[PDB]
Write a protein that binds this ligand. Structure first.
Ligand SMILES: [Mg+2]
Ligand SMILES: [Mg+2]
Ligand SMILES: [Mg+2]
Ligand SMILES: [Mg+2]
Ligand SMILES: [Mg+2]
Ligand SMILES: [Mg+2]
Ligand SMILES: [Mg+2]
Ligand SMILES: [Mg+2]
Ligand SMILES: [Mg+2]
Ligand SMILES: [Mg+2]
Length: 319
RNA sequence: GAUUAACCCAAGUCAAUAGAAGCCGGCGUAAAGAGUGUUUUAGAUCAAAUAAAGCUAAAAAAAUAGACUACGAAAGUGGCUUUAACAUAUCUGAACACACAAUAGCUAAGACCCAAACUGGGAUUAGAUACCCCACUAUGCUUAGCAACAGUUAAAUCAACAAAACUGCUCGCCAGAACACUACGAGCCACAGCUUAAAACUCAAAGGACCUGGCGGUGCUUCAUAUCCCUCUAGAGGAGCCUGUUCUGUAAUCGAUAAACCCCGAUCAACCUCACCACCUCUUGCUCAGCCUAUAUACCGCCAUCUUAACCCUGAUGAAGGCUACAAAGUACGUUAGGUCAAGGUGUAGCCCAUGAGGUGGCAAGAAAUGGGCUACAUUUUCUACCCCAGAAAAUUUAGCAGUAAACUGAGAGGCUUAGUUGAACAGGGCCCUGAAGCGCGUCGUCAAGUCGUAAAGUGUACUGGAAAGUGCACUU
C-alpha cells in the first residue's frame, strides 16, 4: 500500500501560511516511527473500526492505515489539512472517511453501523478510538467520555470501546496514579472507577518538531465491566472534588464543605461514621472503596434531604 | 594455533592463593570546616540594641534626615516621650548543658478588610486569551503544639580557576565510582497499592581546572559597486519570393549541378544529367576494369573545447601565544566517439552478375503557426543643370559610451580587407558580483545502527479537570 510521503515542517509552514517556524502555536509528531509504536500499543487493529481524533498532518493517520483497518473515521477541525487527508483517502480507497467538526460535539454514536454493537459484559466491540489532540482539548474530552461510560451512551453505545489518547506526562501519570502516590488526584479516581487505565510510555518533548518544554504520555482506557461505584456521575464528581479540594489536609476538612454551615459539624460526623472512613486519612490515601462508601452514604443523605445536592459553599460565603 | 628463532631463570620453572610492603597527607571548586552566644574536665602561650507603658503627624505602619553605617551574639533595629537597660581584664574547647534564632511540613482552635493557587460563571479565534472580567476557597494573619585565635609580608608568591600568599596553636572532619543500586523484609493497608534500606556485587575508572578549535556553516550592515541593470536616445512588423520546424500524404527526394540552363541580373521547374520509386537488360566487361562508397570514430594539417622553511622572544621553559607609527617583540603540455576531404596531403578498408554500365515509366507534394534571409517601400522624395540662391515631376531586437549611430563616395584580393565626405539624439536612479571593512548568529531527532527521516528572563515549592504547560507564594540578575 503506497501512500504519499509525510509533509515536512517546511511544507507545513507553507500550508499554514505562517512563513516562519516560531509561530505555529502547535506541536506536530512528524515521526512515522513513534506513531507506528503508538498504533502498535493501541492493540490489534486488523479489520477494526478506528475513530481517530485530532488527525493533523496525518502521521497517526498513516500509521493506522498501515494497519489493516476496515473503516477509519477522521474528524479534523482545520480545513488546511483536509487537502492532505483527501490525498490520503484517495491513496487508500474506501478506508478513510473524513469529517469536519469539533470532537467535543461530534456524535460518534451514529457514525458506525449498528452491527458492531456488542453487549457491555462481552469483549470490547472491535471499535477503537485513537487520539493525539491538543492537551487543551483532551482533558474536557476525557471527562465527557467518562460521563458517557457512566451513562453507557455516546461512543460506548457499541459497548466497551477502547481508547488510546495522548496527554501531558504529568496528566497521564495522574490519570494512571495508584493510592498514596504523589500524583493521586481527582482525575485518577474519576478515570479509575470506570476504566482500566494504563500509562504505557512517555515521548520526550524533543521528539516533536516544534519541541515543547514538556513530555507526552500515551494512556490506554478500557471501560470496566463492573464500575467500582454504582452512583450517578455528577454525584461521584462532587464527592471527589470536595475530598480533593484540600489535598494536604485530612479528608474531613474537605468533606465538611458538602453540607451547610448550620449542620456542618454533625452532618460531617454522621457521614464519616455511617461510612467507616478514618478521619486521619489524607485524600491521596483513599481507595475507590472509601469513595464508594462515601458516595453511598451521601446519596442517602441527599435522598432524605432534597436541598443538599445543589449546595455550593462558596455561594453561601458570598453573603 | 603450529613452526623457526630469540629472551629470562634453571633442576627447576611459575599459574593460583596468602603475606611482606602505606597515613606527620588534606578539608573554596576534586572525599573532607560557617546559625549565634555563654559555660564546660582539659590544652595553648596569644595572659536606628532590648522590654514596658503612654502619645502621635501626614496617608494600622513610620515619607525628609539617611550622601548616615551606629546598636545588637545572630536573626534583626531607623515616629516622639518617660522608665528599666546594653555580660565579661588571655585564647581554643558541646552531638551530649542553658539560652536564643531561622527554615520546611502537618495538627488544634480563632479573625477575615484585602489579595489569592484551586473551583464555578461571563467574553472572546475558527483547537478563541494559558493571558481579560466577576465570585469565592486553601493560603497570606493570630496564638498553642509537634573553621576559631595570635603574629608575618619575608621569601621561590604562584598545577590551574577563584579570593595575594604565610606561619604558629587548637578543635571537628576526610581516606575510589558509591550521599551508587537494590525491599530479603518492616509499618500502613487489607489483594494490590504507598512509605521505608544498608551491604555485598561489578568496574578501571570516577572526579576537578584549562586550551585548541572546527562548523567545507548561517545571515545582515555599510559603502568603491565598474560589466550587468532599469531609465533615456535612434532605427528595425505590411507585400512578394527563398529557407528552418511541425502535421498530413505518396511506391517515391517540392533532393543536388568542380555535372544543366541562361548569355541583363538572378532564377523555377528543366524532356540535361545525377538522386528517389516500380519493372527489366548487360558480364568478363574499359583499359588486370568501374564507384567519390566509408574512415581525419585512420594519422598529419587547420580550427575549436577543457585542465595545468628558518631565526628570535612571551607564558615559572603546559597545551599555547607574538599587535599599537607620538609604535609596546617580532624579523625573514595533455584533452576530445569534437568540426573540417571545397582552395592540403599519407594510408586503410568496402562492392567487383554490382556499391558497375544501361533501358522503360513515374517522381515535380498540400496545409498552417512561428524562426530567419533577399528586393521596393517618396515629398527632409525623384529627374536635369550644378556641386547647395534653379527649373520640372509627383513585440522583441540592433546600436549608444562621438567623429559613434545614420546617410553617401572611392580603392583593392579576387562576402572579405582598406581610404574618405556629411554628421546627430540621450547622457539620470540601482544592482549581480569580486573589491573595502563591521556586527551578529550558530555552536536535529527516532524504532529496532542503517538497505532510518530530515533545514524581562530564570530558580525553587504548592495546586492544576479547558495542563504542548498555567497560575499562586517566596527568591536571583
Ligand atoms: Mg613445582
Ligand atoms: Mg567537596
Ligand atoms: Mg570559648
Ligand atoms: Mg477577593
Ligand atoms: Mg572549633
Ligand atoms: Mg524532385
Ligand atoms: Mg556515380
Ligand atoms: Mg572527428
Ligand atoms: Mg489552571
Ligand atoms: Mg511557578
Amino acid at each position: 500500500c503506497r501512500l504519499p510521503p509525510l509533509p515536512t515542517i517546511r511544507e507545513i509552514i507553507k500550508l499554514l501560511r505562517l512563513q516562519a517556524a516560531k509561530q505555529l502555536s502547535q506541536n506536530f509528531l512528524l515521526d512515522l516511527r513513534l506513531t507506528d509504536k503508538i498504533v502498535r500499543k493501541a492493540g490489534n487493529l486488523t479489520n477494526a473500526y478506528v475513530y481517530e481524533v485530532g488527525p493533523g498532518p496525518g502521521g497517526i493517520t498513516r500509521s493506522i492505515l498501515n494497519a489493516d483497518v476496515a473503516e477509519l473515521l477522521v474528524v479534523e477541525k482545520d480545513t488546511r489539512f483536509i487537502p492532505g487527508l483527501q490525498m490520503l483517502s484517495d491513496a487508500a480507497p474506501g478506508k478513510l472517511r473524513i469529517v469536519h467538526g469539533d470532537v467535543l460535539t461530534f456524535k460518534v454514536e451514529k457514525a458506525f453501523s449498528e452491527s458492531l454493537k456488542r453487549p457491555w459484559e462481552d469483549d470490547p466491540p472491535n471499535v477503537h478510538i485513537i487520539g493525539n489532540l491538543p492537551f487543551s482539548v483532551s482533558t474536557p474530552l476525557i471527562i465527557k467520555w467518562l460521563e458517557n461510560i457512566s451513562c453507557r451512551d455516546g461512543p460506548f453505545v457499541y459497548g466497551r470501546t477502547q481508547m488510546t489518547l495522548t496527554f501531558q506526562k504529568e496528566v497521564a501519570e495522574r490519570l494512571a496514579a495508584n493510592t498514596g502516590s504523589k500524583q493521586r488526584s481527582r482525575l485518577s479516581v474519576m478515570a479509575q472507577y470506570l476504566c482500566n487505565v494504563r500509562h504505557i510510555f512517555t515521548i520526550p518533548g524533543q521528539a516533536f518538531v516544534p519541541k515543547p518544554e514538556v513530555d507526552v504520555g500515551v494512556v490506554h482506557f478500557t471501560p470496566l465491566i463492573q464500575p467500582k461505584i454504582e452512583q450517578p456521575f455528577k454525584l461521584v464528581e462532587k464527592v471527589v472534588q470536595n475530598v480533593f479540594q484540600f489535598r494536604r489536609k485530612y479528608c474531613h476538612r474537605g468533606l465538611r464543605m458538602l453540607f451547610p454551615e448550620a449542620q456542618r459539624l454533625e452532618s460531617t460526623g454522621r457521614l464519616l461514621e455511617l461510612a467507616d472512613i478514618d478521619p486521619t486519612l489524607r485524600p491521596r490515601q483513599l481507595s475507590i472503596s472509601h469513595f464508594k462508601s462515601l458516595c453511598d452514604v451521601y446519596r442517602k443523605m441527599c435522598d432524605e434531604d432534597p436541598q443538599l445536592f445543589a449546595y455550593n459553599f462558596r455561594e453561601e460565603l458570598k453573603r
